[PDB]
Amino acid sequence: MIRLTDNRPIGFIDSGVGGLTVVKEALKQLPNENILFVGDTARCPYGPRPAEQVIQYTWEMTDYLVEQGIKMLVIACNTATAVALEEIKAALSIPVIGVILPGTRAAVKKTQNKQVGIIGTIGTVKSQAYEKALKEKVPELTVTSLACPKFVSVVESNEYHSSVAKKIVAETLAPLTTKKIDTLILGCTHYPLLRPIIQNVMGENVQLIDSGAETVGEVSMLLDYFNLSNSPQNGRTLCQFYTTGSAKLFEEIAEDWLGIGHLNVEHIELG
Template identity: 70%
Template sequence: MSNKQPIGFIDSGVGGLTVVKEALRQLPNENILYLGDTARCPYGPRPAEQVIEFTWQMTRFLIDQGIKLLVIACNTATAVALEEIKAQVDIPVIGVIQPGARAALKASQTGKVGVIGTLGTVKSMSYEKELKEKSPTVSVTSLACPKFVPIVESNQFLSPVAKKVVAETLVPLHNKYLDTLILGCTHYPLLRPIIQNVMGKKVTMIDSGAETVNDLSTLLDYFDLNNYDLNDNKICKFYTTGSPKMFQEIADEWLDIRDLIVEHISLDD
């Protein structure tokens, strides 16, 4: 395996771009391949078996492209498919839940942690299990926010509609005295300013995707996979099962990179 091989990122749609953004900042020499299954997004309401199937399809596609490490940049897919995929592929694989839980416990002063995520992530109780395993006394309040992902995927995350939906959705978290809130879906950081405004300045936001890149950096060191070649022609390529135009509009705005290479692919067997 060559250290110049790319790191692969998979997500149900554009949400994993929040992870890529942090990876570009922390790991500027690394080549990156990203696959967003926007045609079948969101994954949250889907049965676990279907999410596992879709995650395997994305994994196999990027492995065929020659990636050296895989980041499952989707909380729903991490919750149901991470362990199975880790056990069956011969490259390192990392998800987003464990890093997010660890960061939340480190940030919380009161032990009252909130988790917002998709229906699938919340139903799996993956964050609660991870948090309780590390700190049995922590109080966890979880809330599914199924309307958030469609807002981001339709490029409305800065709109008045987004503000209204976020405010209405987060009402159940009022008076829970949370001091830390895990953004348990990689789409949610695009709504972060609105979420922060609704929750208040005293609540610390934990971006699971950004925290994952810290672990990714550690894995690269551990497996001696860092790309140190500063003269390498950097690869940063994006695949989508949906509209390349819509994907590119969101990616351009979020990553602030022009002339992104976005290619449409089909994953149907």
């Protein structure tokens, strides 16, 4: 019946900057937890790379944070989750969670008419990761998967509130509005920045599922299960970001998306 106070940080790894929305949710849902994040922007994206490379690079980010003292790991990008998560999870002693199943679980729980949609990059959509995960849980589901090619560029360019964004989202999601979908999974970590526009286009009757937000929800439970929670008396005292690419660009994007002022971003080297 011993509750332990563990102030070690929770680690988050990503090939790019999308995972920052998962961190944003962690800051809100887990106010007392310390955070470490690595963005391998020098080698982003991982999608087109052979599994061997993806695994190698994901291991390099993992090893870096483990050495920095993390007590739990969140693999924030889709490719690393689908390709390297199982190997890393099996080798490490710390808990490891990805960003596909949590969102899938939530979608299955929220749908009422079993008409579920998922939007994301063409890589994610073509991999069928979400469709397969959804049907393995509820085979009767009618799943519509739609790639949204330009959403990422709009968000990374910090133009997710512009007229260009409203047009791109409206035109891209058009065919998705006539499927009677009542639950839509935001299958790309960049998409939460476009949520208001996406919600308006889909309509108030469509429940949006933020995969990253659901992942953080699982982390909250896992902290309790594994007795790894920090104490509120300590609170969050550390939030550090690392990037293999431009620290300047990373900082600009991160500070904009998180909207909480100055953030600590350090350029690092991997492999």
